[PDB]
Design a protein around this ligand. Structure first.
Ligand SMILES: *[C@@H]1O[C@H](CO[C@H]2O[C@@H](C)[C@@H](O)[C@@H](O)[C@@H]2O)[C@@H](O[C@@H]2O[C@H](CO)[C@@H](O)[C@H](O)[C@H]2NC(C)=O)[C@H](O)[C@H]1NC(C)=O
Ligand SMILES: *[C@@H]1O[C@H](CO[C@@H]2O[C@@H](C)[C@@H](O)[C@@H](O)[C@@H]2O)[C@@H](O)[C@H](O)[C@H]1NC(C)=O
Ligand SMILES: CC(=O)N[C@@H]1[C@@H](O)[C@H](O)[C@@H](CO)O[C@H]1O
Ligand SMILES: CC(=O)N[C@@H]1[C@@H](O)[C@H](O)[C@@H](CO)O[C@H]1O
Ligand SMILES: CC(=O)N[C@@H]1[C@@H](O)[C@H](O)[C@@H](CO)O[C@H]1O
Ligand SMILES: CC(=O)N[C@@H]1[C@@H](O)[C@H](O)[C@@H](CO)O[C@H]1O
Ligand SMILES: *[C@@H]1O[C@H](CO)[C@@H](O)[C@H](O)[C@H]1NC(C)=O
Ligand SMILES: *[C@@H]1O[C@H](CO)[C@@H](O)[C@H](O)[C@H]1NC(C)=O
Ligand SMILES: *[C@@H]1O[C@H](CO)[C@@H](O)[C@H](O)[C@H]1NC(C)=O
Ligand SMILES: C[C@@H]1O[C@@H](O)[C@@H](O)[C@H](O)[C@@H]1O
Ligand SMILES: [Ca+2]
Ligand SMILES: [Ca+2]
Ligand SMILES: [Ca+2]
Ligand SMILES: [Ca+2]
Lengths: 365, 365, 365, 365
């Protein structure tokens, strides 16, 4: 029964733990094509979880992209996702996974419309199911769920419309629903939750696909007492987004429609993340805000990890081990396009971890 | 030495535990082409057992189908069957496998006509063999055999014609025949047995390729006391089959010739399974019958798991693990054709398990 | 420290433990091309050892023959030999391997002419070497060596001509030469030795590439005391060979030139093995000779395991486990050509094991 | 906490432990293209560490060479480097790795110019980083670092010019820098360090890319007492290089510019190694010098391992196991070009180990 360590490690920079090489114009045939990938770790190692939809042998024979028969797979971090290296878990359209210290809890959502429902698996057996309450498709955040002392927490979205979506925090134990809390999210939309835990608190960053280019933030406790916070920055981090504005706790309404999964490290000094410019989905920059993200958006540190690389989803994951540090590490994963492979068929899932040491502002392009 | 749990779990729905993604028009070269696949589990995991006949590199260069040199292979469930993931067991045309709690018992049948015989393997070494007694080829049901308290049970078929076939129960211990019992099957044919065990009883659903579109049923004990039963329904579940009829315990003679391996769960409420319509081998529907299958056929629940998918063989398997449930779960596997792969070269072996919860009538096409 | 059991199992039949399926006209690219393969087992599992010379991707681009940079590899029996499944051991032109109960002893011979020498590897490390003493290339038998109580035995051949070859028994312990004894093989030639042990005795079948169509026999003890025996049969088993003649302890001179690796199970009763007819290298027949091989060759049992399949090298291996038998099992491996693959690039290494029961004369084509 | 044993084994010859077969004109698609490979072993086995830049599927579609996004990978020695067999460690341009008895210490350098820095990883987690001190890029030697009693040592090079490079010994513990020592290397250049240890002495051979065709030598202790030595030979071993000269301890300045990673075994008899001739990068010859390398270059033994084979980088590795010798074995790795594969896309990483027995002067072409 894993607990996050006593304190957050001081973060002064981010270094990549996983970053591969170009898989070239032509691919081998046994690679699995994926989307909505994320990272989750057990006590020894970390894993890629992804929604598989095709084989690389059909690189040029498949629609881009395909909303057909999709299935959740897992692959050891460090290994390429192939038919010989990857393991099927469940059929699914979106998913979440987490390790409690004993077993893996895996959630998948299947179906669109009212027939949509969620399956929960706990170490090799399906343990629980529940159906949609609000008509629309049930949606999992495609990110690590969070486990504390045998209790796992995950946010499920429901509702057919972005202008009337509902969102719930579910508490699970052994793959069984114990209880949930429906959130008052009126006025906003909270999709693609990516979360992390610190000192028995869970902090999640959301994505507003409706009316905001700023990212809504969620903080809650084991008793599901919650608070939703809006960044008091003037710098939107969603994509798409508008330009800089005067700092205020007002939502960023310009180009609020749309969005992509992304993260905000809501701590004592805060870390923000976004594409380099709002005109294009290229590059990735991390910026430190000492007074927190509920302050004015005053940047002390700015790292440009990528300049030209086409960038996509990003989210948190926490390594559950660290036999060397007495502090709780924080890491994030990030989709980067292998431009040597046409049509965005290959989004590498890169990973970065925070370090207590400052680092060069190196470009990883 | 595995023992079955006290009672069957209450089943209100079926959820897929295995369901993959389209393998596209073109396949990679190292995939193994298979037939007669089924599922069997040990204490930790489940495995696909199949008769291998070719490689995917020769997808368009092979006779279809090839009843040449065929060989029994095994693959961890969740992994694709490739030359690097699949493992040779024995040469064979049909097979059965079961795990007793200590070692695997594997049976294979080889040869046609009078030279036909069966090899029995028990944990890495071949321990016993026996020959055809009735001239024709020895035939195994291509499904999990049943092990109880160190004793494993399997049904063996013999005879060159379906209109005078013979069927026997063999009892094994440490891969050696302890004794056998020939069943009185006059008037019927009982091929492709798929079985499960509960409270010292083994129940098998058979397939009549001769004169019945209903599925004959078998119940027996460790002492080889048996009873053969005909469904008193009016709704045939075999393929091919005729239309709905007036309920009776009489066989359905309309389109009785031919058949496909299939299952009937005869418990306190019973579960029946079949293609959606008799006109085509498409779809798959599960129907619940509260009064048992020897009653009149009154349906309470009807789940249409597939509508358009081309459907094939189905049969039982029981997971021998389940650390969350104290009752005996039941699962089935089902061949579903990957329509993106031409000529039915790919039958995915999907799996469904029963749950105590009611679930949506979702289409898994 | 593994020891062979007290007694030989009574053998009345042979059953295939390994026999695969056609790999078709076209192969996937990652298969390793091999020759001089054989089988050897540890306490748990068995392995294929082979001399690798190429990749299947160059199936149609490689010369016959290419006697070039060759390397000894190993692959778990039950797996195809591929780049992801096979493991390099040592560079080598011929080899021998045996497991002592703790570690593997592996021998390879490299070089032609006088620069030829042998490397001995004992669990990941090279432990001893010795060079050619008699001018010609050093040759290992390409079959399992034999270990008894930590002492391992292998026959090494030397000399550039078959009419003046020399042969020595080397006794090794911990991968180091303890002693060797040169055999008086004057008048004959003793290549391609395949051996098995029973009751502290080692029995080997040789191949005469010079002047005999019969297979010479060797029997020796841990103390390197030996006896060389000629079959008193009238039925030669080498290939090529002449027709049947009157039984005598005389060599079979017709077509004595040339030969192929093969085995004779010399016990009481003895088993002989050979091609179906002397005109062609198709098929394989096992014949039982009750009074031993030093008698006249009166056959009681005759099995035609293959009829049309092209047959090649064959030799012994002993499974070192068997927790079901108190007797020593005996098995043989056999090259069978996959005729679906052109130019004999694929020699499937099938394996047969002896059983205490008589079995049907089934054709395994 | 592994320590190398008391004294070096007497070395009279070198035998290949790894030497493969031609991978032919055409390669399969899933092979990883590599550069800067070296070998390092744990308690059980040895591993290939390399810088990956591409896939073999793009054999004819890739530039030679590719200075793009490079990543450090590892593969079990004996296995081919494939997407299914190789594992990503860290992104990197050059690297070093060593095993302390518990965990792997891995260092990689990224960036050119002033942004260059090094990451240190200790068992699955990043533990330390440090940046350039001298403007130019940080460089690791692309060879095994050295661990003694929990202390690991590696040479880090810096400076944008060969005519004023700096080199430091770093001491690491648990993936953490304890201290570092800058060497006085004024007048020379010390790149591509390959090192080995004996009884608390570390001996490294360097490569001078600036003004020397002899290889600079380094000797140091756990407490960083060090000495830089020049061979008093008359035979330069670097490539490129000029011809033989009169023995002296002065640098060989003819063709001193440039160089290639190479090794010198400085022991009580010394061993030198180099290409066959200075005219071309073909062949490899090992020469023994009884009075040590600070003596006159008097050769007693000369082995020509290769004549025609194109040869590249070479360096040391030590097996940390070996239960047959009570003495410390020494091994080296050697890049050899697979000439059946065009454009030197395949550099096989061959390995040789020293032995106390004399061996034939056999050519491994
Ligand atoms: C549901 O939410 C609305 C508006 O959105 C809220 O979302 C959260 C981030 C929360 O912390 C809150 O600060 C934020 O405004 C709530 O409306 C607020 O309160 C009153 C309600 O009459 C109104 O003035 C506005 O809608 C808004 N406040 C301000 C200052 O404008 C609303 O109260 C809440 N409903 C419930 C269930 O209490
Ligand atoms: C540093 O060294 C300079 C030359 O010393 C020689 O060259 C180096 C590379 C080593 O091989 C060393 O053993 C040689 O003796 C000196 O000229 C210089 O004064 C030295 N500087 C200091 C501060 O000691
Ligand atoms: C709600 C629930 O299932 N909790 C149990 C816990 O009480 C028990 O100690 C453990 C043993 O496996 O499993 C879990
Ligand atoms: C005694 C004898 O047979 N001599 C032959 C000789 O022709 C040649 O040296 C070679 C031919 O194979 O082998 C030997
Ligand atoms: C010294 C000795 O015993 N040599 C014998 C010899 O008599 C015999 O000719 C040879 C071949 O049979 O085998 C042996
Ligand atoms: C090769 C050889 O010389 N063999 C002989 C055999 O022919 C002869 O009968 C006898 C000599 O006494 O034995 C030995
Ligand atoms: C066997 O079964 C048939 C039909 O079920 C039945 O009529 C007959 O009595 C049985 N035969 C014997 C010998 O009991
Ligand atoms: C690949 O790289 C360059 C372009 O960067 C290309 O012009 C050339 O053909 C290839 N390599 C070189 C530098 O020769
Ligand atoms: C290095 O790490 C170990 C634990 O891995 C611990 O003893 C301490 O942190 C250091 N110990 C030594 C002996 O170097
Ligand atoms: C081959 C050798 O010669 C014949 C016999 O004289 C010996 O016993 C030995 O078998
Ligand atoms: Ca938005
Ligand atoms: Ca029928
Ligand atoms: Ca012969
Ligand atoms: Ca130089």
């Amino acid at each position: 029964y894993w607990r996050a360590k006593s304190q957050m490690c001081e973060v002064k920079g981010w270094v990549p733990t996983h970053r591969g090489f170009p898989w070239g114009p032509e691919l081998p045939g046994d690679l699995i094509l994926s989307r909505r990938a994320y990272v989750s770790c057990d006590l020894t190692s970390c894993f890629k979880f992804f929604i598989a939809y095709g084989l690389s042998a059909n690189q040029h024979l498949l629609n881009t992209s395909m909303e057909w028969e999709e299935s959740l797979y897992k692959t050891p971090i460090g290994s390429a996702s192939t038919l010989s290296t990857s393991e099927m878990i469940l059929p699914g359209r979106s998913s979440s996974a987490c390790f409690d210290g004993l077993k893996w809890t895996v959630l998948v959502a299947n179906g669109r419309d009212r027939n949509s429902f969620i399956m929960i698996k706990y170490g090799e057996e399906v343990t629980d199911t529940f159906s949609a309450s609000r008509g629309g498709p049930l949606r999992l955040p495609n990110s690590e769920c969070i486990c504390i002392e045998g209790s796992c927490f995950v946010i499920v979205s429901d509702g057919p419309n972005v202008n009337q979506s509902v969102h719930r925090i579910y508490e699970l134990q052994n793959g069984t629903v114990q209880r949930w809390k429906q959130l008052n999210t009126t006025g906003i939309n909270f999709e693609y939750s990516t979360c992390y835990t610190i000192n028995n608190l869970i902090k999640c960053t959301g994505t507003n696909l409706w009316n905001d280019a700023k990212r809504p933030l969620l903080r809650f406790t084991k008793e599901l007492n919650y608070q939703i916070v809006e960044p008091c920055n003037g710098a939107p981090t969603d994509f798409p987004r508008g330009g800089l504005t005067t700092p205020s706790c007002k939502m960023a309404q310009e180009k609020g429609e749309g969005g992509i999964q992304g993260f905000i490290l809501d701590e004592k000094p805060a870390w923000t993340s976004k594409t380099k410019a709002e005109s294009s989905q290229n590059g990735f920059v991390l910026e430190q805000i000492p007074n927190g993200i509920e302050s004015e958006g005053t940047v002390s540190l700015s790292y440009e990890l990528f300049s030209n690389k086409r960038t996509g989803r990003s989210g948190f994951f926490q390594p559950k081990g660290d036999l060397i540090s007495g502090c709780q590490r924080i890491c994030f994963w990030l989709e980067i396009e292998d431009q040597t492979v046409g049509l965005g068929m290959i989004q590498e899932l890169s990973t970065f971890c925070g370090i207590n040491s400052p680092v060069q502002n190196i470009n990883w392009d």
